[PDB]
Design a protein around this ligand. Structure first.
Ligand code: GTQ
Ligand code: GTQ
Ligand code: GTQ
Ligand code: GTQ
Ligand code: FE2
Ligand code: FE2
Ligand code: FE2
Ligand code: FE2
Lengths: 366, 366, 366, 366
């Protein structure tokens, strides 16, 4: 009976008589920094999530144009720290937030530039749809950046970046900046003005210790809150996804849904998410795959890595190409449709929702 | 060297030449929903937390006057749901938030009133500095409300309240409403218009199963995300705190600091916090005790339960009496000073900060 | 097909030709400390557990006679340490083991005696069906021993005992002595020759900190591997079990099965078992209750605390009275039958089996 | 004072007068299945672990001779199940136990033989110092066996083995058979008489899903009690150990001690041990390395994989060659000395000791 009621259809039984005494009470509320629940229940406590953030798509071709022009006109260095352009959700009041929890940006580093070293409580990762040439130095450990690589920079790790070539590179940054600003957890420290090691090894020290499947160094027996892997290289991700599709061909369980291969990047000390606030995945859909529509608590962002296809959000189809980016705010129904084989990088605030027992998932047909 | 720099003293090296091409770039950013990092680094990523919320104190005598007047002029019922007055931080832009994460309110239920049944993903607790007469029915289990009691209503539990007497009662509510609204995790369901059981037992079913020290029913071997204890009664809290002070008198370790007894209300299935987002404590300071100044990540709220004393926040002393309430936003230096024996109820968002590895603590002298 | 085969009915296909060369091979095995699998598969790896321990019952009246006579003839003191009589399973080859994992003993302390202080890696508890007068001093904290009390002495805690009266007292000890001896984990240290504190408070320091339901001292926020509660007093256990039966009367879920109230004694820092190797429970069956037959991996021991009834093991009924003790070895089918209201104390090695993922449970009808 | 006392030097104060009444008491103890503590304290509860197992070394050349001769004279098949020769500790009374917890055996499979399919609660792994040709089929998933590979068969997984060539292969088995027999946790089921899949892929399905560093299939988000990796191939182990030694050369932390590279094989869903009862490691010592002497609770076994060196146990040096095996019982002081670069495979019961909080470690110089 009452379970089908919403805030529009429910009887409003707390409507006081509009008298001078009531207006005086309400005036007194304002003077005393008091705001009654009864005038705002439905907004404070909706039937289901109703984000101020809206679903939205940014074209890579547009992001690249603006990043390149920024490369001409704006020098990178101290103070501003990075030449990064945050994707700003139209629904979030002028804040540089792609969602209420996450920052997503395109960053551009021109020939031979250095972005100086700093650290901050905010967790961060880099992802590269295309390019090479930059190394990012994380606690003194140079990490090469290449197409298809996920690079991590967990909170409070010193990091700076350098272009070792005569050619520009762009990539995307994800951070829990919006969550951290609203929740007041932000600390920041300036490090050196130049990265602490200009060497450019093929593979970082973190990788050389931690990227052997199923093996753990005896010197690393303590679990970490964030992954000690600095780089999740394209080769491994590509091979994982191929094997899932091959295993499917062979009638063996592997794919998460038919024609839908997918992995989660994990902290190898625990098997959990890469960082406390941020979950990263990579999806590969066979040509013609259409995912079942999901509603999920919290926000996610995808970047198209390869192939052609579309996303549906709130019933609306938007065609997508290589590098395009979209955000799905909390509880917005979404699905992906593959035209060709369709590869996507994904990040979300799901580790926050799951840690606090706020996660819910509705899946079409299930 | 660079570790002592802040956003005011650092060199700003990303100041572009102010030309028509630059203004055209910046205009293009606006059209494309792009906001560059370099114009806002320092605000997005402060050196240490700088909350928009400000420290603030609400007098119980004022809260009571406004709650009582609301009792005359505003009927309680469906739609508005509760006659509750939220403490609204002056720094939080007109939102009914005591801090960026927490709602705190005074609720008033007059003679023989019922507040109807509903549930919501938001976690909630009731605390009572004074009064008796109300029972709150939580998933059908009537729970008596009395002076000094902490009553819990974890997320998604049906709850409504009824005054069984001819006398009014007031109490405080705490909820993770602000966190839940900003993060988009809110669900809500209307239940019955009248509580489902009007019986008024001395002790609830939850208590009769779970409030025997060190004992666990074989029917309750599964751990819960929130405490199954609906009521943490004043008797136990009072006795715990007395025993700590007695143990101190006897030269035995017990108190958390000298003359400072304190407990945390816990989920007995895990030994952890009562609910995923909210931590509740109770403190008792010997006359003359002055706590060491703390900076802590995240916000806390205290209500004075008994005795006289003061709080210091940002170096500013405010004298406190029975029922007065104050909020300490993230990283604000705070201490308590006991004039007489000084009893306080405390809640905070610390389980959020600790789950996500954002907690930090600075203690004066340590 | 092959799933119904056992070691008696399976084809034995590794029967070598009995030749001089084979006997020479087998002789060589002996010289080289080699024992082939094929001559002993079925014994090493049975179809289901087949303990050398047998179900067995010890009469309290017999245990008391022998303990009392030991009180006359054997002095208690250093070296031998305790006047304790271990229940020795007839199936375990003369070892003083009630089961392959547990020691159970009756201990007797005469008027004004002291049993001196020591510690050992082996975990221990005391349980009292009857008597008063002894205090056990655990890390310097005197703990009163009374009828119905469970007293804990986790591994590596100094403990000694003293009779403060002119009257003898007996109780039962449980320890993981057999597990610890076979697995080679035993350490032992002699402490003082007399307990370190002869005071006899009603309640220990551990209890005064930890026995308030749902409350945790801020000085005790670190979780422990064993419970910091030294005494689980009869009052709480009795009240817990009564409330379950009352809740059942009221149509409310509480009892573990119909007419079967039961609790587990738990570590309040975690909600888990009292000690890493040993699980303690207390059961109360309504007159006429018959439990469903269980097979469970690992061994358990019960002592009858009050009332009359029977146990069935391997289909065999043995009538039981106050104080009688029985052991149920691994996978032996067992049930309890209540003649009157039937109260039993229970301990087991279940935390070992569950930690190592060896637990299985078969329940009749389910 | 009393801390330096042991069971040989302590005063024995419970020596009763040897009278007819005492001998009658003691006789009565025997009739009633009672064994007093005071006549056996020191044996039941030693000052530190004193295993019945003794340190011992088995020569690979001897193991190979006996396995090969067994290959001629004993057919492999149903009933006996495997042609495996257990290493029997001289101190363990004729039981086929290398230590009180572990079985270690050499298994031999001749040209074209099949060992039929079964499962058991006991956990198992295979390790190969030399050879190729056998596949082991684990829950229907064929897993190739090659030099340097660790193959897993967690408890209750169906497994059988087949030689796909005209050449014999030998390897070592480790199981928690002794623990499981003494603790009564053993279940066993006969599966098919022939393996269920004779195909011989280079890599199993488990590996194709789980052996990509830092990546987890979305279809495998549930944690497992044992590793889903069926094969830890030599390539990865070799590369891990090389990188540690290279990182050391570069002044970077990696090795567990100087010139001592080492990894632990882990469950990738948790970062923990491969199976609940058994820990597997692989060590590589630079020529000339001498490890610091350790005492550790519980037993370990090593097999020499490559190079030459020695072990010291109880102060006694034994020179070791490729394939030689040794056991170090609980609390025996041990160290390894590398003559050439010295590679060893290691297994132990450490996950049992650590789960139950019985682990202790003494390291020389630290
Ligand atoms: O360090 C970075 O590369 C960075 C990039 C961003 O897009 C936002 C904040 C950052 O600190
Ligand atoms: O149910 C309540 O009593 C309640 C009280 C508040 O102050 C705010 C939200 C609520 O749902
Ligand atoms: O300390 C004791 O009371 C004790 C009792 C036993 O029955 C066996 C071993 C012990 O250490
Ligand atoms: O299945 C095996 O290969 C096996 C090997 C052994 O050495 C002992 C028990 C077994 O079940
Ligand atoms: Fe950064
Ligand atoms: Fe509510
Ligand atoms: Fe003892
Ligand atoms: Fe086997």
């Amino acid at each position: 009976q009452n379970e089908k009621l919403d805030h529009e259809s429910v009887t409003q039984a707390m409507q006081p008589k509009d008298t001078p005494e009531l207006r005086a009470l309400y005036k007194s509320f304002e003077e005393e920094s008091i705001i009654p629940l009864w005038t705002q229940l439905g907004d404070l406590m909706p039937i289901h999530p109703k984000s101020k953030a809206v679903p939205h798509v940014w074209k890579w071709s547009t992001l690249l144009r603006l990043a390149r022009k920024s490369g001409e006109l704006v020098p990178v260095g101290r103070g501003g720290e990075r030449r990064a352009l945050g994707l700003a959700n139209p629904g979030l009041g002028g804040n540089a937030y792609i969602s209420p929890t996450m920052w997503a940006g395109i960053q551009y580093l021109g020939p031979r530039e250095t972005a100086p070293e700093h650290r901050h409580s905010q967790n961060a990762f880099r992802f590269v749809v295309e390019g090479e040439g930059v190394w990012t130095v994380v606690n003194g450990d140079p990490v090469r950046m290449s197409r298809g690589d996920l690079l991590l920079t967990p909170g409070w790790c010193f990091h700076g970046h350098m272009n070792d070539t005569d050619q520009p590179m762009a990539w995307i940054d994800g951070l829990d900046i919006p969550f951290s600003q609203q929740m007041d957890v932000g600390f920041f420290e300036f490090g050196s003005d130049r990265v602490t090691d200009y060497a450019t090894p093929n593979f970082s020290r973190g990788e050389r210790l931690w990227c052997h499947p199923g093996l753990r160094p005896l010197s690393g027996l303590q679990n970490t809150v964030a992954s000690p892997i600095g780089a999740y290289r394209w080769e491994f991700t590509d091979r994982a996804l191929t094997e899932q599709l091959l295993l499917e061909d062979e009638g063996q369980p592997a794919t998460v849904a038919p024609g839908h291969a997918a992995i989660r990047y994990v902290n190898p000390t625990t098997g959990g998410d890469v960082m406390p606030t941020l979950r990263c995945e990579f999806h590969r859909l066979r040509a013609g795959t259409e995912t079942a529509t999901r509603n999920e608590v919290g926000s996610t962002v995808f970047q198209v890595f390869e192939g052609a296809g579309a996303v549906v959000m709130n019933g609306e189809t938007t065609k997508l190409e290589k590098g395009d980016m979209f955000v799905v705010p909390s509880w917005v129904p979404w699905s992906l449709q593959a035209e060709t084989q369709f590869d996507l990088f994904r990040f979300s605030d799901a580790p926050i929702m799951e840690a606090l027992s706020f996660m819910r998932t509705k899946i079409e047909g299930q």
